[PDB]
Design a protein around this ligand. Structure first.
Ligand SMILES: Nc1ncnc2c1ncn2[C@@H]1O[C@H](COP(=O)(O)OP(=O)(O)O)[C@@H](O)[C@H]1O
Ligand SMILES: Nc1ncnc2c1ncn2[C@@H]1O[C@H](COP(=O)(O)OP(=O)(O)O)[C@@H](O)[C@H]1O
Lengths: 197, 199
């Protein structure tokens, strides 16, 4: 009982068979703003809804796929480029891809977006501004990164963060808790047809 | 009214596999040009999707001009091409997806490095190496893109560069003896026999 047409499955075929549409949920924000805390909680929530969702962050990218990359300007650009391509591949597989990198530069995030929006069939790219004040992330500072200021070119302290002008989702994590941030993102996905009811 | 639950930290591998009713793995196809990797990969992916299983094909169409567009054709580029593909296929397996790679991957050391990414991973991930084995005579008869006839093309695997055949892979399929549906049946049966998809 094995059936297939010649060639590759189309995107509509895959989406229909798996009962799910792929997209990229692109988190951006300062260190300690809550990207990682929100991404792992959102991923679990979606998995409880029987949805394929997968988090991309430093833990599974930096020392594997991108282990060849340094911290010079060219390396940083290439790091985001490759994360953009990988996130697109996950979306093409009918998975909700959640990226949790500071991604400070407008141009880098824009090129990741264009890979999705210019894809032969356009793939949703949902930019989520995880927005916490500098005073809040310095008070949080769960790794001591802000106190070191012994660390150079640090986003928001000694390097620039380029805030998105008008992202698809804007979440102020000093006024919404983790569950509320997960609720906001999931409701956006549901209201835009990307996950079932 | 909401309905949200989660524990601190990341989902564990067993939690993810259980919630999704599926275990992730890499099905690594290797073989000569025109041996049937892409033909089998697209049929297999369709078959698994029909079983409501996440499966995803990695090949030249979605890798070469995207993630790996920076790479050329020198030996160093070639090694790096397979290296990255090994990492990406691992990420898909970690997502509880059946990742199917369809690259010639002619060198034993490159396939071995990809394999060790899976087998030495903190939680070990199955790496299923499938020798798509067709004689030089058959693939020269097939030559669906004229690649073997060009000989015009340099350092071509099986003609002017080596193919290092797997010694004893998890699956060995002679595509001059089995049709595409039978090749899909063998791989799918192996997946079920090893608990990676429901029976
Ligand atoms: N609403 C919220 N969302 C996310 N994190 C929060 C929130 N409120 C407080 N925090 C705390 O802020 C810190 C954010 O750390 P982390 O998720 O590692 O941020 P990032 O990945 O952006 O560097 C965590 O200690 C978290 O517990
Ligand atoms: N039993 C078989 N398995 C796979 N392909 C076959 C088989 N018999 C004939 N073919 C043909 O051989 C060619 C294989 O092409 P392709 O899948 O592109 O090989 P590769 O991906 O290894 O370069 C296709 O034309 C396909 O129709």
């Amino acid at each position: 009982n094995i059936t297939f047409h010649p060639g590759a499955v189309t995107q509509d075929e895959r989406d229909t068979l798996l009962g799910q549409k792929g997209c990229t949920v692109w988190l951006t924000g300062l260190s300690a703003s809550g990207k990682s805390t929100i991404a792992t909680a959102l991923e679990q929530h979606l998995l409880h809804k029987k949805l394929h969702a997968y988090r991309l962050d430093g833990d599974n990218i930096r020392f594997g796929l991108n282990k060849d990359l340094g911290f010079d300007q060219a390396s940083r650009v290439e790091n985001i480029r490759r994360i953009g391509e990988v996130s697109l591949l996950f979306a093409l597989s009918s998975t909700i891809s959640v990226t949790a990198f500071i991604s400070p530069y407008i141009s880098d995030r824009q090129l990741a977006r264009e890979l999705h929006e210019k894809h032969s069939s356009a793939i949703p790219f949902i930019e989520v501004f995880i927005d916490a004040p500098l005073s809040v992330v310095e008070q949080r500072d769960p790794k001591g990164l802000y106190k070191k200021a012994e660390i150079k070119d640090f986003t928001g302290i000694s390097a620039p963060y380029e805030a998105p002008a008008n992202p698809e989702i804007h979440i102020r994590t000093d006024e919404v808790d983790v569950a509320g941030a997960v609720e906001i993102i999931t409701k956006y996905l549901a209201d835009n047809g990307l996950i079932p009811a």
